[PDB]
């Protein structure tokens, strides 16, 4: 009853151009079996949404990567939020929700916006820049580590540690094994900065530790919650901002709409998250036999959710392969859905918004003027290099 496919969604050929194979996965049926890795897959919006919103049946505590924590030891101590289920997930989640809350955004927005304006001013003096290294990477690195309260030394470990985390979600292919092989210095730095004395007052890290006396988390749980923000707080924001610039360069008509109304900046970034989905995939593990889209899945089975495919499913979206900055993006799963829905989504949206705002007000044209190079990652989609010429407005 279940179609079996040989598509490897963690192969370089798939990463290079995933959209044909994603249509093949969607159109084969609501539930497929991927013979390459012995996992079930769901690529349509309907099933991805249903799986995300049943955390009891499709749990996260056995890992959201390929590895089943009931069978293999995790490569690091499990995340207290990403790799936990309710009720254990609930109170650590509440702490991170308050640390990255709407009220918190008010305290950082002025500085985040000023740094975005300053970066675009700087890039316009150069003219021809690399929109990844010089913009999508440079800007989040200039605001988020400071907002965490991290010292200056050792920050070069942050993006390599994130690449380790996201490649480690994948199967034991070369991308994963090579990341783990080189991991030791990046893990050592990150684990050390999670300790309370190393986090500057007022920052995200210090605020997590401050919650340890409310009864929501214990003192020994605070370092791992800081670890979550150091794991996830940068790489997808980089990829999302790079995706947005990529979209505005490929769809000049949408840049012109954004220039004419800079208040479209927030939705232009949200549409970029739907369109290029920085997080392509996450796994769940069945806790029981379950019927999903007319398919019977046994207990203890890994289910691969194609978030990027769900965000381009024509059963849900009109013209899904068009970048439309006034699209009603509500309901896309680029940040997930349900109880694990990205707790740092307000930070990512703030950075994306103020950067696209600076571009909307300061830049007249964005033209690719060099070879575009893709970055390969078992879990993330993003660019390695995006040479563009910025023309001032």
Ligand X SMILES: COc1ccc(C(=O)O)cc1
Residues annotated within the binding site for heme b are 89, 93, 284, 340, 342
d(CA 226, CA 221): 9
Binding mask 237-276 for ligand HEM (x = CB under 6 A): x--x--------------------------------x---
Asked if residue 231 binds ligand X (CB under 6 A), the reply is yes
User: Which of ligand X, ligand HEM, none does residue 60 bind to, with CB < 5 to 8 Å depending on kind?
Assistant: ligand HEM
- Smaller CB separation from ligand HEM, 183 or 237: 237
Beta carbons within 8 Å of 52's beta carbon, 6+ residues apart: 58, 305, 333, 336, 337, 338, 340
Asked if residue 190 binds ligand X (CB under 6 A), the reply is no
Hey, CA dihedral for 97, 274, 255, 133, is it positive or negative? positive
Asked if residue 311 binds ligand HEM (CB under 6 A), the reply is no
- Smaller CB separation from ligand X, 96 or 297: 96
* Choices 10-18, 109-117, 315-323, 331-339 (CB under 6 A): range interacting with ligand HEM: 331-339
- Smaller CB separation from ligand X, 166 or 357: 166
Beta carbons within 8 Å of 283's beta carbon, 6+ residues apart: 39, 63, 64, 65, 66, 169, 302, 303, 304, 305
User: Which of ligand HEM, ligand X, none does residue 233 bind to, with CB < 5 to 8 Å depending on kind?
Assistant: ligand HEM
Q: Mark 181-207 as b/e (b = at least 16 C-beta within 10 Å).
A: eebeebbebbbebbeeebbeeebbbbb
Binding site for ligand HEM (CB under 6 A): 60, 64, 81-82, 93, 96, 100, 228-229, 232-233, 236-237, 240, 273, 278-279, 282, 307, 334-336, 340, 342-344, 347-348
Binding site for ligand X (CB under 6 A): 79, 81-82, 165-166, 228, 231-232, 279
């Amino acid at each position: 009853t279940i179609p079996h496919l040989a598509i490897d969604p963690f192969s370089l050929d798939f990463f290079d151009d995933p959209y044909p194979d994603q249509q093949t996965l969607r159109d084969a049926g609501p539930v497929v079996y991927l013979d390459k890795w012995n996992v079930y897959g769901v690529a349509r919006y309907a099933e991805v949404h249903a799986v995300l919103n049943d955390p009891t049946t499709f749990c996260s505590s056995r890992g959201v990567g390929l590895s089943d924590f009931k069978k293999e030891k995790p490569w690091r101590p499990p995340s207290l939020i990403l790799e936990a289920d309710p009720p254990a997930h609930t109170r650590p989640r509440a702490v991170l929700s308050k640390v990255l809350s709407p009220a918190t955004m008010k305290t950082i927005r002025d500085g985040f916006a000023a740094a975005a304006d300053a970066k675009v001013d700087e890039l316009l003096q150069r003219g021809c820049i690399d929109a990844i290294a010089d913009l999508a990477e440079a800007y989040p690195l200039s605001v988020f580590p400071d907002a965490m309260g991290l010292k200056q030394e050792g920050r070069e470990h942050l993006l390599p540690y994130a690449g380790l985390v996201t490649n480690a979600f994948g199967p034991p292919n070369e991308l994963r094994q090579t990341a783990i092989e080189r991991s030791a210095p990046h893990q050592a730095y990150v684990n050390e900065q999670c300790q309370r004395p190393n986090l500057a007052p007022g920052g995200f890290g210090a605020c997590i530790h401050a919650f340890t006396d409310t009864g929501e988390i214990t003192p020994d749980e605070a370092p791992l919650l800081v670890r979550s923000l150091l794991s996830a707080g940068l790489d997808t924001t980089v990829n999302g901002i790079g995706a947005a610039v990529y979209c505005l360069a490929r769809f000049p008509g949408e840049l012109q709409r954004l220039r004419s109304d800079p208040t479209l900046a927030r939705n232009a970034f949200e549409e970029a998250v739907r369109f290029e989905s920085p997080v392509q995939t996450f796994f769940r593990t069945t806790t029981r036999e379950v019927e999903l889209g007319g398919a019977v899945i046994g207990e203890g089975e890994k289910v691969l959710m194609f978030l990027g495919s769900a965000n381009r499913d024509p059963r849900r979206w009109s013209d899904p392969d068009l970048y439309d900055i006034t699209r009603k993006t509500s309901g896309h799963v680029g940040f997930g859905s349900g109880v694990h829905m990205c707790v740092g989504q307000l930070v990512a949206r703030l950075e994306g918004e103020v950067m696209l705002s600076a571009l909307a007000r300061k830049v007249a044209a964005i033209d690719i003027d060099g070879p575009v190079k893709r970055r390969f990652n078992n879990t993330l989609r993003g660019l390695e290099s995006l040479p563009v010429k910025l023309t001032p407005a």
